Write a protein that binds this DNA or RNA. Structure first.
Lengths: 426, 176, 38
RNA sequence: UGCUGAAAGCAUCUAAGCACGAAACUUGCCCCGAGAUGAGUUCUCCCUGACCCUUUAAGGGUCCUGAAGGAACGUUGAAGA
RNA sequence: CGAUGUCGGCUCAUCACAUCCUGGGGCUGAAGUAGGUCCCAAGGGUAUGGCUGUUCGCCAUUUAAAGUGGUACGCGAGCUGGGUUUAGAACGUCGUGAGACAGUUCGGUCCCUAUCUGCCGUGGGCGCUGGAGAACUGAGGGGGGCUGCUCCUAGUACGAGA
RNA sequence: GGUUCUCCCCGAAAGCUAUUUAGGUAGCGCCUCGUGAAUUCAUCUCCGGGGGUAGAGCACUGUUUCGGCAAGGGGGUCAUCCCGACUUACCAACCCGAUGCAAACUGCGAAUACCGGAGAAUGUUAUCACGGGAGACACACGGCGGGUGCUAACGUCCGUCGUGAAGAGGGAAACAACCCAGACCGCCAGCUAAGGUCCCAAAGUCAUGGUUAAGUGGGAAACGAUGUGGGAAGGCCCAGACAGCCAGGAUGUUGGCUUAGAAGCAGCCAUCAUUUAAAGAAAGCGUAAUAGCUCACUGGUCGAGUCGGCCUGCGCGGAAGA
């Protein structure tokens, strides 16, 4: 089926140490995602003063140094793809003739081994079909040289047209299953979404802990470990806060530095809800020079798919070490360029997002628990069991939190459905 | 078959006559003969019909159990009626008896009629449900199943043959 | 109604029967628990 | 999808019985069709004379009579090489 | 290898059902219209074009639907030669060259009077137990077997509406 | 490519080596004919041998899993490895115990084959040498031992045997290679081998005991199943055995966590206790906790079998093609 070369034996991670242009290059989030996928390397060797080679993307001495490990495993790490219909890009694809396991496979292997969602699994397996397609559809040369070109005559199509057509039949059946998954998911969205949805998505540096956050914050907790489980992958779920209630976000996995763009094309299943979102919020600390290519790519994506007129509120990263002070209300202008006191452990404080989510909806008095002596029989405790939100503050005379909240159509239906025997409102 | 180990008790008002493998019964509700048996004998000498395997077919015990249940059913048929409480509810769902023809205006474009067979009687004190009386419970079960198969109870309404306040399991799909 | 080649007892209310020559489960509690041909 | 029902005191569409159930099957509709050698049926019409050798239900030859009908031949057809 | 003519198209088809539509059911996150999956079912039906030789493929537009396979990837003693199946010539690349290309371009001869089987029609000889004329019974066999839209039921059932 | 009359006797090979050789040829092995020799040659019994295949084993060469603590790093305060707080939550390099795995491992080791002796019996001296004359050097299937292949192929390459080639006859429907058996001729003869005895189509509608109900027999796997037959055990029990069922189940079993729901759909202290057949801060399920069973359960009128698991014979479904 989709068989590859054997794995499970130790090799090195091949990456050029000194490109002398972007610099920074801390490796902590890269090594954390290597840890998260579980890619093993018993001994770490560093190539001192290794500039990149634009000719072959590898060094001969470096290659014959790793070749003892290659004699056991049989592959190395060579990046890049983007091969298309020109023969020059055919040459570019064949340029990595050396023993290769691709960075696309090594990055995608964690979600491939532990893929929670179904749409993301279908998109990652068709992305798998794309990266074998890069070396198969654009890689017609070696079997053409070996076989002697028997079977090209007759139709005017290219060689190995049966194999390329069979793979095209594979992507057609998988994309039809994707479109029927999209049909049933849109049927579910018709059941759930009521005319609007307040979603964002936020990515960047790794080590977030999204599912641990989910069972820690939703007041419904699951026994789990601090290390990564099969609990992962970006899912739209409800967020428990102090006051508003129903907010829905994706829980995005840790993002990889500097060379997703075909990888975000693969991850467009997750990033599909990014475009339809009105609010755009993301958590990145501005001390990094390495993120500038990704900033340019994000801005180019925003120019491509439009809807970039709304300004983005800031939440800053790498705050996990200091924890130096409490939030303080400082007002210079309406933009308020002030710091962000987010902490994943303690709730205190989330005041600017609390102020925004409170400014979205107000008027929390419209609930009215009626004051009548208790009777037995029909229609009692239904308004008790209906709906409420927030927490309890001490008040007398039965102003209990129990709410109904509907638009103008049930504002009109309020006078029609109920007889209003209390005769207090006019 | 320990139901075949128990003969069926026959009262004074029920007259039983056996003609070989054919069993004929007599009662106040009516005379009836449906079943003739194959590998089970019947006789009685102490007003209780006996059910026994003939030879070693390893099945005549089970056939004697069937014959015991059949004779119990026809005895209760010739003393009393069997199936009542056939209800089928709906908006504009009507039923009124007329001889051996019963009409069921159940939301169809055409009115539909059920020809009742011989040996059944149907009455309906209220429009939405029909009560039956019969001496053969197999025939009255087939008739009640046909009347219930004219309009199958969908889960969203909650119809069917139910006794007193009995609940059909109602699906709660599409609650926006 | 599944036509799966391995017919199981999916729940406690499931009951298996052999009708004609084939074997099927019937459930009085959950209607999607019935299958065929195992 | 069911009724009644034991095997398996409950249950169960099945093992004994029984009732539904589709453009599929067999008929229904339309053509060929008794070479249907299993060569069929019905109605009508026509023939009811002699002699020899007989290797015998025997069978062959001669004279007379050769019907019902068919074929041939002409005129042909909106039938047809 | 003492010759089984190679794609596609046209004409004509036949079979399997792993079923595109129509038909009957189950389950459904099946409220109704509409869907998804699974079972039974092969009776019938199962597009016109622009592009280049195309099988494919893109697209316009239609239809209830534009099924998947087998039949020498059906069918050249039925048709075609647009392409490989040649010999003339040119471009690119290789070869100091003759020449080559699992590259391109222009052009480039397709025979058969049907013995046998098989079909489609149509007769002659005899048989059917005396010979004829004419009606039939029906063992068998074939043909047919598709489906849209609109209206009433009814804006009813259902749905808070749409 | 063809190679022309008859009868009798014997009867192959498609291998090794070499080959400007691979479809040819030479020598040898195999065939025939003719001389000569000897208990020469086969077979069986006994006797003398060498082995490293099958199998096994893990000491060696390698490979592999688990359990037994440090010479130093991963390092533990480690710029206190303190010539004493190091000596752990890993290898204690190594070593010990248990469990495996090998064509290129052997501290073991068959059956067979093979070589050489002695003995009888049988065999037209079959054995060896020399001389005249060839053919052949394109092999195929099946069983066994394998390399390769996918423990695919009517695949390919070897060792050995049988068959066809070059062997008819009988059987497996039809069939070179499978089974029985090697046709000198004739018989309107008897027995038999493989195979069979209901009709085609010869011979048992033979006998005894059992199995299956699906047309298994007469195509097919994982898996699924109260199909049915046999066996050996276990739990309940006339202190009533398994079924179904009227009725019965409360005060710390309302302490904490959207508190006039913590308690049954979200978990931790927690069942000390009461009218302990039955006390449940309830799991499997459940409609809108306030219908119901296993619920730590039964006074019960109800009465001889019942319920699981193990093995085995024959079945069923998985099972769709032009």
């Amino acid at each position: 089926m989709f068989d590859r070369y054997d794995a499970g034996e130790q090799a090195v991670l091949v990456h050029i140490y000194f490109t002398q242009d972007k610099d920074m290059e801390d490796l902590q989030e890269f090594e954390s995602l290597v840890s998260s996928a579980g890619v093993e390397a018993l001994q770490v060797i560093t190539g001192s003063r290794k500039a990149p080679h634009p000719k072959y993307f590898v060094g001969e001495g470096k290659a014959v140094e790793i070749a003892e490990a290659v004699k056991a495993t049989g592959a190395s790490v060579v990046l890049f793809d983007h091969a298309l219909s020109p023969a020059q890009e055919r040459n570019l694809e064949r340029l990595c003739e050396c023993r290769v396991i691709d960075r696309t496979g090594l990055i995608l292997d964690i979600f491939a081994q532990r893929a929670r969602t179904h749409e993301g699994k279908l998109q990652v397996e068709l992305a798998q079909l794309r990266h074998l397609a890069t070396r198969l559809v654009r890689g017609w040369t070696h079997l053409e040289r070996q076989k002697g070109g028997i079977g090209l005559r007759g139709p005017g199509e290219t060689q190995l047209e049966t194999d390329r057509r069979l793979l095209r039949n594979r992507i057609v059946q998988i994309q039809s299953r994707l479109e029927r998954v999209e049909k049933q998911r849109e049927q579910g969205r018709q059941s759930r979404i009521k005319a609007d949805v307040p979603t964002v998505s936020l990515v960047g540096y790794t080590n977030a802990g999204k599912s641990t956050l989910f069972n820690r914050i939703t007041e419904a907790r699951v026994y789990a470990a601090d290390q990564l489980f099969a609990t992962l992958d970006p899912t739209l779920r409800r967020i428990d806060v102090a006051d508003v209630g129903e907010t829905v976000l994706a829980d995005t996995v840790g993002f990889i530095r500097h060379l997703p763009h075909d990888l975000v094309a693969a991850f467009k299943a997750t990033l599909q809800e990014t475009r339809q979102a009105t609010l755009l919020l993301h958590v990145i600390d501005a001390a990094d020079v390495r993120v500038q290519e990704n900033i340019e790519a994000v801005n180019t994506v925003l120019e491509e798919i439009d809807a970039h007129e709304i300004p983005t509120l800031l939440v800053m990263n790498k705050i996990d070490m200091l924890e130096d002070f409490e939030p303080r209300i400082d007002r210079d202008e309406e933009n308020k360029p002030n710091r962000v006191w987010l902490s994943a452990q303690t709730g205190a404080g989330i005041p600017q997002l609390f102020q925004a989510l409170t400014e979205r909806l107000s008027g929390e008095v419209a609930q009215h628990t009626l004051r009548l002596p208790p009777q037995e029989g029909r229609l009692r405790s239904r308004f008790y069991q209906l709906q409420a939100i927030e927490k309890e503050w001490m008040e007398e005379d039965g102003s209990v939190s129990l709410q109904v909240r509907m638009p103008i159509v049930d504002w009109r239906r309020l006078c029609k459905q109920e007889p209003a025997l209390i005769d207090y409102l006019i | 078959s320990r139901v075949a180990k128990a003969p069926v008790v026959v009262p004074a008002g029920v007259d039983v006559k056996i003609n070989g493998q054919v069993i004929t019964i007599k009662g106040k509700n009516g005379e009836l003969t449906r079943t003739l048996n194959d590998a089970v004998e019947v006789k009685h000498a102490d007003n209780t019909l006996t059910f026994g395997p003939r030879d070693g077919y390893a099945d005549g015990w089970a056939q004697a159990g069937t014959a015991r249940a059949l004779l119990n059913s026809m005895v209760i048929g010739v003393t009393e009626g069997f199936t009542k409480k056939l209800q089928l509810v709906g908006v504009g769902y009507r039923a009124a008896v007329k001889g051996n023809v019963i009409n069921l205006s159940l939301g169809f474009s055409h009115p539909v009629d059920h020809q009742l067979p011989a040996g059944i009687t149907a009455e309906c004190p209220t429009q939405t449900e029909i009560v039956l009386k019969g001496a053969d419970k197999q025939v009255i079960g087939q008739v009640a199943a046909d009347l219930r198969a004219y309009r199958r109870p969908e889960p969203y309404k909650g119809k069917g043959v139910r006794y007193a306040d009995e609940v059909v399991r109602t699906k709660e799909a599409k609650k926006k | 109604m599944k036509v799966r080649a391995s017919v199981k007892k999916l729940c406690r209310n499931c009951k298996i029967v052999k009708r004609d020559g084939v074997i099927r489960v019937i459930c009085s509690a959950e209607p999607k628990h019935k299958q065929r041909q195992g």
